[PDB]
Amino acid sequence: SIVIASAARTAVGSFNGAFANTPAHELGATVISAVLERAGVAAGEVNEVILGQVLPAGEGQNPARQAAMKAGVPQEATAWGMNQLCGSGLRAVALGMQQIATGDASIIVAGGMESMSMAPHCAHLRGGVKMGDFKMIDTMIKDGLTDAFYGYHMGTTAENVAKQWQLSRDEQDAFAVASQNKAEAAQKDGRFKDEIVPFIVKGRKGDITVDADEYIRHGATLDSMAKLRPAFDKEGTVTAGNASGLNDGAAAALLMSEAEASRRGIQPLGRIVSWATVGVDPKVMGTGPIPASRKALERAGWKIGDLDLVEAHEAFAAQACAVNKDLGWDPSIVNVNGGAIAIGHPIGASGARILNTLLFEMKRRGARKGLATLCIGGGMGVAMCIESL
Amino acid sequence: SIVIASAARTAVGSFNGAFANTPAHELGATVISAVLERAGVAAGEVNEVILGQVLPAGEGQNPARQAAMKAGVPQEATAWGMNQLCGSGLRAVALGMQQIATGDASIIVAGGMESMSMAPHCAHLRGGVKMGDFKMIDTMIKDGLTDAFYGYHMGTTAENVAKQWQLSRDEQDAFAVASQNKAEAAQKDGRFKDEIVPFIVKGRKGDITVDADEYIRHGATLDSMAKLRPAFDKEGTVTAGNASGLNDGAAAALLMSEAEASRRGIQPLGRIVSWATVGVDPKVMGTGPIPASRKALERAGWKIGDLDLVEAHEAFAAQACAVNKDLGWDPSIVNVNGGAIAIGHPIGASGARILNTLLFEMKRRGARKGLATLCIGGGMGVAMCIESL
Amino acid sequence: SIVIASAARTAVGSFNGAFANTPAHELGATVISAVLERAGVAAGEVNEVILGQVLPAGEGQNPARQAAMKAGVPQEATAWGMNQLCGSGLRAVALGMQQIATGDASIIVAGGMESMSMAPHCAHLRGGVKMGDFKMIDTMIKDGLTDAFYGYHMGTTAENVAKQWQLSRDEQDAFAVASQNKAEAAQKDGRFKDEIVPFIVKGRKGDITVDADEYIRHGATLDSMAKLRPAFDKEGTVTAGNASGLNDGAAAALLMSEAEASRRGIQPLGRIVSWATVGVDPKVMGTGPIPASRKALERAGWKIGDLDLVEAHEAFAAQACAVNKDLGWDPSIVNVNGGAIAIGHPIGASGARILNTLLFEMKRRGARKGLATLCIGGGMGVAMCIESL
Amino acid sequence: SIVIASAARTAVGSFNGAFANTPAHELGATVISAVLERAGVAAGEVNEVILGQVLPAGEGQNPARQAAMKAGVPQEATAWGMNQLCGSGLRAVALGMQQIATGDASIIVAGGMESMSMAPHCAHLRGGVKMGDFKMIDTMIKDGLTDAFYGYHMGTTAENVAKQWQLSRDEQDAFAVASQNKAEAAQKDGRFKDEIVPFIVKGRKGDITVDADEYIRHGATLDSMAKLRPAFDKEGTVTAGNASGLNDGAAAALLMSEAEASRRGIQPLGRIVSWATVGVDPKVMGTGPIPASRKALERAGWKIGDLDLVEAHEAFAAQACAVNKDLGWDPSIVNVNGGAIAIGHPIGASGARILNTLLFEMKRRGARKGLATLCIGGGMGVAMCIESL
Numbered sequence A, B, C, D: 001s002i003v004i005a006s007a008a009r010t011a012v013g014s015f016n017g018a019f020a021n022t023p024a025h026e027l028g029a030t031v032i033s034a035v036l037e038r039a040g041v042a043a044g045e046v047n048e049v050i051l052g053q054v055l056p057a058g059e060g061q062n063p064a065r066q067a068a069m070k071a072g073v074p075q076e077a078t079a080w081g082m083n084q085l086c087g088s089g090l091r092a093v094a095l096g097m098q099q100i101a102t103g104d105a106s107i108i109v110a111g112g113m114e115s116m117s118m119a120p121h122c123a124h125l126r127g128g129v130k131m132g133d134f135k136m137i138d139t140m141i142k143d144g145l146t147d148a149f150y151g152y153h154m155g156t157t158a159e160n161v162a163k164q165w166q167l168s169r170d171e172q173d174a175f176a177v178a179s180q181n182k183a184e185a186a187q188k189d190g191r192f193k194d195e196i197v198p199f200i201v202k203g204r205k206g207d208i209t210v211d212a213d214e215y216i217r218h219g220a221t222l223d224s225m226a227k228l229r230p231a232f233d234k235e236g237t238v239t240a241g242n243a244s245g246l247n248d249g250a251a252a253a254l255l256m257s258e259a260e261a262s263r264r265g266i267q268p269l270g271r272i273v274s275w276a277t278v279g280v281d282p283k284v285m286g287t288g289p290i291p292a293s294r295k296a297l298e299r300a301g302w303k304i305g306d307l308d309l310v311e312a313h314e315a316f317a318a319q320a321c322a323v324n325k326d327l328g329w330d331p332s333i334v335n336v337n338g339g340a341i342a343i344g345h346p347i348g349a350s351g352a353r354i355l356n357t358l359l360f361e362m363k364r365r366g367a368r369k370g371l372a373t374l375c376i377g378g379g380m381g382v383a384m385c386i387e388s389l
């Protein structure tokens, strides 16, 4: 029914790094063109653009639209942004999939984009301030990284899950180092070249082409991971090393009916067979994927043993390990090329980013069945099933 | 197929007025409760809450999820926000329709919220500011009022439409007072009492109940509308008198299959027969309603003559007339109880606000075929056709 | 040797009151003009202007020089500011007196000025702020009212003194009401008319002439005082009612040699016979006046008994009482026209402010020997002795 | 009668460089300790610390006092800051001299300190920001480098002087290069070691010791200067290269009567024979040292020809060439070790900074008579004559 005709993403950039000054809509713009040209479809053919974004502050009216306009998409089309936090970039893919199934559209471009570097500090000042200090609020931390119900960082929700499943520091660090090692394996082999479209950072001191994930750490040993201090709980287990990072990047994909694909002689990356989203307790948001992944598989009629490959968001090694333990899928088909702990996590784009990894890694190894899932801040989960054509 | 079990909106505050310090999701929580109470349907049964919101800076993670949790929707359910600007509120409703239509969900609460009053000031400050003055940005104007392509205010795009459709000062001023007269009337007549759900402003000075819109200016005369200066073009014609304002507010509707309402013994306010959205030159964004409505009507198999009522958002008396004159529809069924010019413009919510005034009026007067439509900064429109039983 | 030929002060404005948007150097300018006029001295004769100012942030380069230049003092002259906190306005006069004594200048305008209302919020942002919240600091509170070593407000050092001297809530409130009542009586009787020069607050819808000290409460009751809660210690004794206020104001004096005075035929307001400054423990800064007054008196060769009139700065009722008991002078000759609790406390100006009150009350009643004294945050005192010619 | 017993300054850091996060009173503290140590005088014997500072916003109550307390000066002492802009640090020495001359003190530590790096941005926000963007003001530029009467940068007053004296870009850039080469030679030779007291920048990740002036360019070229664009008038002459810099530092001298020094067996750095301050046209503030020096020499009874060494502040190549031109002293006794173009210009400290360089160079070369002099924004000059004992 609905295929993903084509994909693309920038490389994930380190916090205040390669894209320290790049607006999200501009990474979304480049990423939009990539899927247009990779599929040989013209921007004058895109009905609408759906883009996940969690930190829009200061970017101006409807960033999703600036990204489509800059991308070359004609004005007679439509564009919009959305936010289911970390799951945003993949929920957009499912939302675009729904515009087509209801016949409200032929061709959608869907994904997400985040610039955590460009997120401003804010303060409500209309009332004036007669006397005393006031706080300038970091929107990245407040709107993206802090639980609105329990008042603490997502790193604390990860300490909770850790306690639940009794995950030792050692095990988490092992997972963390494996992630970094698998990504360093995939980077130096070229398995990210395909899915990555280079981004040119226009500049005054001379242009700059960025086409490599800069967050990945090389020579990451168990030892280097064990010298780290806890980053949330002083007697805890969660560290900077065994947890995702703060990053910049974007990721989209082109959607059309399977028949449309055939009309244009296009060889899609996969068919979207099912998706699903379920809520859990914010205190243990890390558990999101389990109910989400099983719901998805149910709607697909698949068994967890039918999966050839899995991309499972690495918010924290803590929650990552506990999700694997329960679902029991072969941990040698999960995050084959490493995950967020190494690749980074530009929130709003992340769900569409691992979709990119999942799809291109299915094409090169010939896998037929794949799943992508992420935990979500505020206690949610989301998952999707892709089938190779 | 898909019906609106019920609906509810808060009263619309004045900028820095009655909801001066009320966070968006607070107004949303009340409204979510409101649709559930009015339909007699437990919170647990809600699958997902969908809310438009344009100004979320500083309000914390996924404000849509916050509205649901305070309203009492269980953690099991899911929530997310989205941003198609002025159409956001009406877009969540259709999207809520699609969740059910594609069988992914049974019961949806959709609508819009907006605290233009709580919207903060911001600046990017991570790269440092080595030397020299800088600007602290007003998020309300930056992300809500200013065109991201041509660098100017919505009022300047309303002016463009004026020059184009040769609309004059009088035609506009006549439209504004007629709108301020119809509203004041409807309010006195008690015509808003059913849709509005009272919000308590929990204060220290004393708990205040807000049960009426406060932007409605009584005794509006053309004489007083004429003593006004132009604030967009010195020698122009668009005045604060003939344009909507900055406003706070929230609105919503409970969605479910028509058979579902049936088995649940619920008498629905309408059925959503279709919807659409199209793009247009950003510089004349006020024309949005024109293609979008011609789109939605077609999908409904209706002729303009078939409509017995209409709700067309009152951004500016300029864009508004140009709509009325292009479609031809009978102006005396357009905005029977006043418009945003008189009522207010809580951006993200205006799409869900007008749906309410439409549905309760379609029911008060027994109209059969309705339609709500807005224009959207950036150059778009959203349309949707309603039908009672 | 050195005399005060003339003096003058603006009325003292309430916080964000009469001078809400009047920069301090404007108040200084009116006051420089008044002392010149009152003395029969031309601006072109002024060698140097010296002004205490504690909170100059944002006012531009050398506000002292701005006041002088706006006053018509010629470019050939010099001007500078200085900061010894609450003592600034008095110290500046001593410093002025020293330029003359060492033969370095003939004619000096000395005093201080302060707009607490115009003090800005601020933040260090040159290195950026990687991530996380940051405070916009209130320069008034930070640079004016907080101790730099122990981190608490001046009102806490007042508690410290209240415990040290065992001063009851009741004794302090009585002192509080007495100050207010004396000031109101002095105001109605016209006792402030001589010293005060009217200030014209320029407007567009009407200039306003301010010539009355607006911080003085009329008909103040002990009950209004007793009903207030401690403001610095939850089970404390210092309240907003028994403390000084935040205010705007300027005050100055024109110095020249006694012989230069005689040559001109001016009948001076007084001869400066000595001054002193001494440090104390920051924790109990309120006690600064004790050692300072004692050193000033010894330098003058006077006994405490020789004083006919005293002006001792009322930072807080607590410290004022402790100084009076410690020094032992008849309280009936101290702050005979009220003090800072009623009149207000423009930090940089206060020392000259109370010099003004001392001087005109001395001439009024024919008192031969006077003393002015203030406590200083950070733990210091300053005192000056004056004798009539 | 008054001698300089000892002197010290920190190295001068570059804008946001070695002292980027070091508060100014911390630099001052170190220098106070150094002069005490170098003289053989105990902290317990200090009566008063007087420190020039132009940018104290956000640093807390009376930074002069924080430095004295941090340095170990007893609480019974006193401390105050003052501001005559660029002249502050030298004036402070004259002022301390006057305390001793008038018999009010015996031992004074006087100088200046500045952290241009740590100066904050600011805004007046009490009245309330109605709606829309407001300016965050850079205190350094506003209160340090901008003229309060004509609105433009100090670099523009230098263009004024350039045109007036017809100084080419060539003569200025020649002066700029010569200043850098002299200071580099003096640094290489160790001529700054005597005056500099090392500073320890505390660091969680290590302590760094700063004992070299870091603004100084090594091997500066004529071509490096010639390349630059004028910074203040597009067809002008003054550039970043021929102008002084933005820097951090502190500097001081320890003062006592000649007779006191003799009692203690101290061999002083010099006798203070006279000082003078004089105003000029703000438009041409750079010319300030001309009348100040003449008046100082006239007060000392010296001919310009009697000077053996001279330190004349290098605000701008343009103004320094003019001063030398009108005064006519052998340029080969002026800034024998380079000046502020090379070494830097920490506003409040620079006047003591040049005092230090003159004092130690006088001692090494055996010069009998010397002069230090600075121009001052807003139109003033200060100078001081020193003779060897």
Ligand SMILES: O=C[C@H](O)[C@H](O)[C@H](O)[C@H](O)CO
Binding pocket: C005, C006, C007, C008, C038, C039, C193, C194, C195, C267, C268, C269
């Ligand atoms: O000794 C001279 C005086 O200071 C003035 O003449 C006096 O203060 C008057 O109030 C003038 O208005």
Ligand SMILES: O=C[C@H](O)[C@H](O)[C@H](O)[C@H](O)CO
Binding pocket: D005, D006, D007, D008, D037, D038, D039, D193, D194, D195, D267, D268, D269
């Ligand atoms: O390292 C120590 C100092 O460089 C000297 O003691 C200095 O010359 C003093 O100022 C002497 O008065």
Ligand SMILES: O=C[C@H](O)[C@H](O)[C@H](O)[C@H](O)CO
Binding pocket: C075, C076, D279, D280, D281, D284, D287, D288
């Ligand atoms: O406008 C003033 C004159 O033109 C002179 O420049 C003046 O006497 C200055 O104070 C000295 O430079």
Ligand SMILES: O=C[C@H](O)[C@H](O)[C@H](O)[C@H](O)CO
Binding pocket: D182, D331, D332, D333, D334, D335, D336, D337
């Ligand atoms: O004593 C030697 C000095 O290095 C020179 O005097 C210096 O170069 C002059 O200031 C420029 O002519």
